[PDB]
Amino acid sequence: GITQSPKYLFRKEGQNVTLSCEQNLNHDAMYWYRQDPGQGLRLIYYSQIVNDFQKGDIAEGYSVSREKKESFPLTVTSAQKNPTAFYLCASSMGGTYEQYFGPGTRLTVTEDLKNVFPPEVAVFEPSEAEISHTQKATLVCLATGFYPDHVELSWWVNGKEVHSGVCTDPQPLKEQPALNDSRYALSSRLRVSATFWQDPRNHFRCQVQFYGLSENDEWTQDRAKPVTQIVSAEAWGRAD
Amino acid sequence: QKEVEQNSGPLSVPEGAIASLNCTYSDRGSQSFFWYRQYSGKSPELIMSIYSNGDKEDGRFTAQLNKASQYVSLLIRDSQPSDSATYLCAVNALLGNQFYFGTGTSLTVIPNIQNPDPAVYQLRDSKSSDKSVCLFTDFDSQTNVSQSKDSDVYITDKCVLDMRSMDFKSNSAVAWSNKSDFACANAFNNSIIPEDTFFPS
Amino acid sequence: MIQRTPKIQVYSRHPAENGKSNFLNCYVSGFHPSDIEVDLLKNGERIEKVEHSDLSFSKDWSFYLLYYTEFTPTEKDEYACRVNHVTLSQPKIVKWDRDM
Amino acid sequence: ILDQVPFSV
Amino acid sequence: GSHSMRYFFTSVSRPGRGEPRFIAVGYVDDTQFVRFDSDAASQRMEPRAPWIEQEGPEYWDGETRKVKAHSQTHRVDLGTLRGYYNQSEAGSHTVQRMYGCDVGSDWRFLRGYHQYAYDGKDYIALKEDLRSWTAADMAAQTTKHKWEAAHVAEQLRAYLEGTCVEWLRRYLENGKETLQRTDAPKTHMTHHAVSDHEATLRCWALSFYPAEITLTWQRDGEDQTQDTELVETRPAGDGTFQKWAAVVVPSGQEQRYTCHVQHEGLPKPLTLRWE
Numbered sequence: 054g055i056t057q058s059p060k061y062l063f064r065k066e067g068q069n070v071t072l073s074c075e076q077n078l079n080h081d082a083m084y085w086y087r088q089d090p091g092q093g094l095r096l097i098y099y100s101q102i103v104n105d106f107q108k109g110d111i112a113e114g115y116s117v118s119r120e121k122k123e124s125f126p127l128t129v130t131s132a133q134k135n136p137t138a139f140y141l142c143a144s145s146m147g148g149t150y151e152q153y154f155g156p157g158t159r160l161t162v163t164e165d166l167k168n169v170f171p172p173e174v175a176v177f178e179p180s181e182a183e184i185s186h187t188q189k190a191t192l193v194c195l196a197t198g199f200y201p202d203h204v205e206l207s208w209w210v211n212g213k214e215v216h217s218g219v220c221t222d223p224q225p226l227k228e229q230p231a232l233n234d235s236r237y238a239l240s241s242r243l244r245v246s247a248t249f250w251q252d253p254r255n256h257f258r259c260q261v262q263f264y265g266l267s268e269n270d271e272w273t274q275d276r277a278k279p280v281t282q283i284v285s286a287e288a289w290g291r292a293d
Numbered sequence: 294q295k296e297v298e299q300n301s302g303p304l305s306v307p308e309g310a311i312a313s314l315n316c317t318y319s320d321r322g323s324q325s326f327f328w329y330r331q332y333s334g335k336s337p338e339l340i341m342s343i344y345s346n347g348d349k350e351d352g353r354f355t356a357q358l359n360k361a362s363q364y365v366s367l368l369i370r371d372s373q374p375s376d377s378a379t380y381l382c383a384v385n386a387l388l389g390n391q392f393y394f395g396t397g398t399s400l401t402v403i404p405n406i407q408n409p410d411p412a413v414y415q416l417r418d419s420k421s422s423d424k425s426v427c428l429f430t431d432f433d434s435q436t437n438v439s440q441s442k443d444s445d446v447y448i449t450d451k452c453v454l455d456m457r458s459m460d461f462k463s464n465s466a467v468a469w470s471n472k473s474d475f476a477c478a479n480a481f482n483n484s485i486i487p488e489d490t491f492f493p494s
Numbered sequence: 495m496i497q498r499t500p501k502i503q504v505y506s507r508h509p510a511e512n513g514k515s516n517f518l519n520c521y522v523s524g525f526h527p528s529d530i531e532v533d534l535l536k537n538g539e540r541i542e543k544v545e546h547s548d549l550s551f552s553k554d555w556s557f558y559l560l561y562y563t564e565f566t567p568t569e570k571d572e573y574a575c576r577v578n579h580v581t582l583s584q585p586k587i588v589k590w591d592r593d594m
Numbered sequence: 595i596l597d598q599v600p601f602s603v
Numbered sequence: 604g605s606h607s608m609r610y611f612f613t614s615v616s617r618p619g620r621g622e623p624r625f626i627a628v629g630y631v632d633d634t635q636f637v638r639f640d641s642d643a644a645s646q647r648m649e650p651r652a653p654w655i656e657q658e659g660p661e662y663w664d665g666e667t668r669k670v671k672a673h674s675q676t677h678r679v680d681l682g683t684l685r686g687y688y689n690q691s692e693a694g695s696h697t698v699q700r701m702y703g704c705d706v707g708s709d710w711r712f713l714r715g716y717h718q719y720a721y722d723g724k725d726y727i728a729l730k731e732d733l734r735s736w737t738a739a740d741m742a743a744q745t746t747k748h749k750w751e752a753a754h755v756a757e758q759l760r761a762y763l764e765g766t767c768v769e770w771l772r773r774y775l776e777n778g779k780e781t782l783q784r785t786d787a788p789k790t791h792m793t794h795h796a797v798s799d800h801e802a803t804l805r806c807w808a809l810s811f812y813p814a815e816i817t818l819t820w821q822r823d824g825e826d827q828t829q830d831t832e833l834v835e836t837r838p839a840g841d842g843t844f845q846k847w848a849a850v851v852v853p854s855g856q857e858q859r860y861t862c863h864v865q866h867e868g869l870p871k872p873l874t875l876r877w878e
Binding site for chain 1: 327335336337339342390394395396397415417420424426447453463469
Binding site: 597598600602603 | 610629662666669670672673675676679680683684687700702719726727746749750753755758759762766767770
């Protein structure tokens with residue numbers, strides 16, 4: 054009974070961001086952590102009772118209030134030097150009891166909104182050599198040039214989402230790792246039977262859900278607005 | 294040191310074998326010990342909790358606790374692909390009324406695939422028909438891939454896909470670039486190609 | 495509810511001799527509930543600045559307290575302890591005996 | 595040292 | 604056994620004139636080393652022994668946050684318990700809790716306990732095996748089933764068998780000059796003329812630690828329980844205890860009566876006479 058909102062959040066540098074955490078297990082203790090990619094958890098703030106809160110290991114630039122027992126709002130300020138992180142909220146019966154984590158909030162703060170781009174999705178058909186040699190066929194999907202890395206990829210065979218024969222990269226790669234505001238690229242592969250790919254009635258689609266600016270965010274660039282959208286690419290069977 | 298220490302290095306274990314995850318802590322009035330499982334991009338899920346010395350069996354993983362020599366372990370039987378995640382070690386502290394977490398230990402099970410047929414195929418775009426990608430697939434478990442030393446060529450890590458229509462798995466990695474003279478025989482030269490791949494025309 | 499009457503004991507910390515500083519103790523025990531008024535008297539007058547121990551109870555959940563103060567006894571200085579509880583209809587006074 | 599915060603009745 | 608560490612908690616409600624009062628004390632053997640009073644001014648876990656003062660601020664800050672949580676648990680306990688018996692909000696009720704561990708000569712776990720009371724009577728207590736519960740009345744069975752479904756006994760056993768005996772060993776080593784001491788009783792005897800034929804002999808035993816002591820009267824070497832008065836052990840105030848036993852004796856034959864003092868600091872018990 055612990056929920057956080059939003060699941061994905063994107064703001065411009067220079068203002069305060071409020072991350073919400075509601076708890077329903079009647080717990081007195083609530084905790085706020087941030088998790089950088091490839092690292093562990095680090096404590097930001099925690100509260101023992103309804104009107105108390107204590108600083109964690111990294112409380113610089115983080116404000117926290119506790120007005121009621123069920124709500125624990127975390128407001129990250131512009132004084133924070135690296136606000137971009139995976140923020141996790143937890144609660145427990147006491148200070149020494151096990152903690153249960155909420156779903157989590159992925160916060161990304163960039164210099165300007167010019168770096169936000171939706172992904173470009175394209176599906177690549179299998180090769181004739183793979184089909185003749187292994188009697189199997191792999192479709193490869195590429196989502197390129199998106200920022201941030203808030204993406205969710207899924208394969209859809211004949212209008213139904215599949216998981217068997219699907220493999221997606223655990224985390225997208227930076228197209229230019231030396232850059233701080235680099236775009237991201239993510240790949241995936243769907244391997245089906247050679248007799249299944251050669252059926253022209255089968256329909257293959259690589260759906261990529263992208264989480265970007267909301268419809269209420271302002272946008273002054275003449276470029277297409279990078280709203281939270283879905284970009285996909287289709288491919289049909291070919292007996293050739 | 295930190296209050297809870299565990300080897301954060303990536304630990305690999307063959308599929309079906311026993312995966313052993315170790316964790317050490319500094320005694321701060323510690324009496325409760327927990328194991329959390331966290332997948333890539335999701336929240337930590339409490340999967341184990343032990344309070345007394347000995348072994349505690351639940352499902353396919355058992356928790357082992359020894360308070361004399363401060364360390365608590367977690368053994369996983371029949372390593373399945375769903376077990377590939379980072380496992381966080383939690384230790385409470387009655388001194389200070391605190392709750393400490395470890396940095397986590399990434400676990401990645403490796404499938405014991407037999408009869409590999411390594412090869413590097415080229416795949417063209419379904420609609421553009423001018424962009425091309427390369428696919429290093431069907432290679433054994435010992436083969437590893439590496440990142441490209443060129444900012445124009447993009448390499449991905451291994452990926453284990455499971456066909457349940459068949460009863461086999463196959464590792465695979467993809468590579469592509471925009472050089473317009475890209476060759477699938479020049480992509481994976483950085484990685485150790487295991488002298489058994491098939492490069493088509 | 496269980497209501498027990500306190501057992502009052504008045505005594506000195508060390509063997510009482512005239513002219514030497516000592517401590518006057520009033521040890522109440524075996525009572526319930528916790529609320530209890532204890533006063534140390536000197537010739538019938540209440541002594542100010544009387545410290546008491548921290549509240550603790552026995553195996554039978556009955557509380558015990560130690561009320562003490564520093565004093566110097568003489569030959570004809572009557573000291574006593576006045577204890578008031580919900581079990582007592584009126585405060586009970588127990589005089590201090592140099593041989594008890 | 596004290597024990598954990600006890601459970602309520 | 605040899606040594607023990609105990610905590611005592613008391614929460615008495617004050618309906619109409621404030622929140623319930625919470626008092627918590629800690630004891631190692633017969634010495635109090637920590638305390639907390641909700642009506643006090645410090646609002647913190649305060650030291651009551653010299654050897655506990657060496658603990659760092661992480662200890663005291665953690666102990667202070669733990670006792671306030673203990674008081675907060677008893678606040679909802681006082682309200683919940685009044686509903687189990689359909690009792691009014693006008694009556695003042697008392698909740699008491701104590702737990703601790705006993706160690707042997709090897710300073711290893713020997714015995715553990717965790718007891719709970721309501722209005723001066725047993726409510727629920729952990730059994731000796733630290734795995735079952737003893738519910739007193741029907742309303743206590745609700746707490747048992749609630750604590751069994753939450754696996755409370757398993758976690759309480761981790762303290763009683765674990766950090767209780769491990770931190771008892773820590774306190775015994777840090778306060779060796781105080782806790783591991785053994786003060787033999789300073790004994791004497793007084794004579795008081797009661798009547799022309801009767802006279803009371805009073806066997807005194809002062810300034811001894813720990814509080815465990817036994818006073819026995821004998822006549823011609825045989826135990827005499829009749830016509831004997833024994834008062835309960837008194838805390839002196841300076842960390843030691845007092846106790847005396849008396850007997851009324853016919854005038855002239857006081858030489859036949861002997862007092863016997865059994866204490867930890869006496870390998871063989873002392874014999875006290877009048878002359």
